[PDB]
Design a protein around this ligand. Sequence first.
Ligand SMILES: CC(=O)/C(C)=C/C=C/C=C\C=C\C=C/C=C/C=C/C=C/C=C\C=C\C/C=C/C(=O)O
Length: 225
Amino acid sequence: SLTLSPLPPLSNDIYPIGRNSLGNLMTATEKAKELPQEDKSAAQFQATSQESYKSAVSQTTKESPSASLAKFCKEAETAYPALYKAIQANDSASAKELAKSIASKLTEVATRAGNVAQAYNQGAAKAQEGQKLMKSALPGSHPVKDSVDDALQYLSPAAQVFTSMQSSLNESAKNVVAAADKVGKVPANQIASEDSGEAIANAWAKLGVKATAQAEAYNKWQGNQ
Ligand SMILES: CC(=O)/C(C)=C/C=C/C=C\C=C\C=C/C=C/C=C/C=C/C=C\C=C\C/C=C/C(=O)O
């Protein structure tokens, strides 16, 4: 049997994307915006550093994975019960078509998450370059050097959060297609791990509540960078 509800970590009690997991990187981004602008030696490096932070946040906003997930969860509330009914009716052609649709939506959300991870990992390579340039070019105390160090410390764990979201959603897409492929081939009740269409819908609805909240919190935050 295959799990059609959200998979870890999206099934976690605490939604995995938010200040709980990204707050150190958020703070670092706020500090980078507000760096002082009196130092001549640092000015160009600091502009480049600030543009790197801003590029990554802008990329994040373009993708908006939590907002996209929340939209999916709304769809899931009706799409999974409809699929479950097709499974129970041993309706292979219907189940396949419905699962294909669900999977398409899941894989688009997963790609958005993956795109955020890619932006962060690419940002880390920029920070690596900046760290070396500034260690030599900017001998004394410069808050931008700390901002680069912050990026190096926090970007890869942050990227991993998004990679794990991507992995979960891609697995959900695989599972829903695989489930529909069994319809008409084995007994219907052996296909899904869950005991009802409603149980599956409720699990996506619960995730949707969390994703919606985060989407709105993030929207606020990015508009002040
Ligand atoms: C090359 C050269 O000459 C020099 C000088 C390079 C210097 C580079 C310096 C810094 C680089 C930072 C890069 C990336 C930052 C990224 C910051 C990201 C912050 C993200 C914060 C929160 C994210 C929340 C996501 C929510 C989305 C959702 O829930 O949908």
